[PDB]
Amino acid sequence: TCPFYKKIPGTGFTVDAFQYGVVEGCTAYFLTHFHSDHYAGLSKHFTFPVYCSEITGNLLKNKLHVQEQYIHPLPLDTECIVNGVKVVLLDANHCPGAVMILFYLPNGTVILHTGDFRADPSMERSLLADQKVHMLYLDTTYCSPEYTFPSQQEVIRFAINTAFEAVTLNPHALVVCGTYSIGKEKVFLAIADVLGSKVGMSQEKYKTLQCLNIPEINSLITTDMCSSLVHLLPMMQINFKGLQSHLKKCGGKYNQILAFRPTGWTHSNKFTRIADVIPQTKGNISIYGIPYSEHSSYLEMKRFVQWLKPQKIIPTVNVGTWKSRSTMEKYFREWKLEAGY
Ligand code: NI
Numbered sequence: 001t002c003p004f005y006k007k008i009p010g011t012g013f014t015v016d017a018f019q020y021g022v023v024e025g026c027t028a029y030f031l032t033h034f035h036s037d038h039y040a041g042l043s044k045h046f047t048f049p050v051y052c053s054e055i056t057g058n059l060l061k062n063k064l065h066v067q068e069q070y071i072h073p074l075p076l077d078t079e080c081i082v083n084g085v086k087v088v089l090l091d092a093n094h095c096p097g098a099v100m101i102l103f104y105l106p107n108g109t110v111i112l113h114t115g116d117f118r119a120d121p122s123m124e125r126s127l128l129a130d131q132k133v134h135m136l137y138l139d140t141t142y143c144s145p146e147y148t149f150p151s152q153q154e155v156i157r158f159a160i161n162t163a164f165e166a167v168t169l170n171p172h173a174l175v176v177c178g179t180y181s182i183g184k185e186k187v188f189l190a191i192a193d194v195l196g197s198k199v200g201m202s203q204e205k206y207k208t209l210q211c212l213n214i215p216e217i218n219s220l221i222t223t224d225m226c227s228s229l230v231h232l233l234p235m236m237q238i239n240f241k242g243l244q245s246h247l248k249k250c251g252g253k254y255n256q257i258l259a260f261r262p263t264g265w266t267h268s269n270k271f272t273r274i275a276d277v278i279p280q281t282k283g284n285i286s287i288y289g290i291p292y293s294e295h296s297s298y299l300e301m302k303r304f305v306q307w308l309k310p311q312k313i314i315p316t317v318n319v320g321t322w323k324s325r326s327t328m329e330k331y332f333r334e335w336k337l338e339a340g341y
Pocket residue numbers: 033035094116
């Protein structure tokens with residue numbers, strides 16, 4: 001049974017609600033982005049209309065084989081009418097194709113659903129600037145003040161400088177980057193670019209990347225592993241055994257691996273600056289955990305919400321425990337009292 005925080009009142013609409021069977025009274029199913037916890041239940045046998053971005057629609061068609069007749073892609077930043085209701089899709093600054101959705105209810109209520117997002121001050125000059133929002137369905141992933149991490153720009157600067165230094169010292173070092181979903185593509189693209197290489201990967205991952213409208217992509221990726229000195233592997237393989245085994249397969253082309261695990265937040269963020277991050281090393285293998293987040297930090301979240309001044313907030317993440325729920329509701333009230341709405 002579909003939970004309440006996935007239904008939009010006064011509409012026939014649900015958001016990221018594909019794992020509950022046919023939802024009573026749902027006439028349109030919105031998908032905010034192509035991450036498995038959100039698309040869970042879509043497949044080629046789905047026969048209701050799906051509304052989403054062009055990119056998300058590319059992945060539904062090619063990866064999950066959803067039939068074209070049920071995929072309704074919408075352009076960003078454009079007022080659109082769905083089943084008698086005005087909607088706008090906005091960039092969520094999450095993974096490729098990820099959107100927030102503004103719903104203009106027939107009774108005059110305005111609702112913003114963030115999907116997954118990383119709040120940014122640039123959002124204060126989108127189409128959100130122009131009108132009041134009554135209800136906010138908020139990505140509360142890191143809604144607590146211990147959740148700090150650097151900008152994405154700082155993290156990429158660290159990774160490029162690290163990779164470039166290592167490979168310039170040793171031209172026989174291989175760089176490996178972990179992945180388990182879309183998002184965070186800048187990590188491996190930035191490093192390949194500084195090294196003058198293409199990124200090598202499996203056919204299945206290359207296929208996924210060909211759906212994402214990245215400019216000049218045919219210039220940056222390849223399935224020819226032998227022509228590439230940046231390789232992508234599944235995240236699960238980014239450990240000493242997995243990497244040793246990979247290094248065996250490269251046929252004595254390489255004698256060292258430098259590997260990156262982009263995580264979200266880890267507790268080593270409570271102590272160590274990005275500048276000061278160090279790898280775990282065993283022999284000729286080193287592994288760096290880097291905190292590349294595609295969700296709001298606590299401070300970025302707070303600033304967006306205090307700018308927006310919603311009358312009601314409904315969290316969409318960390319909803320399963322009373323302690324989590326109580327924690328979030330305390331922060332929302334602090335924010336409201338400090339800013340005066
Ligand atoms: Ni996500």
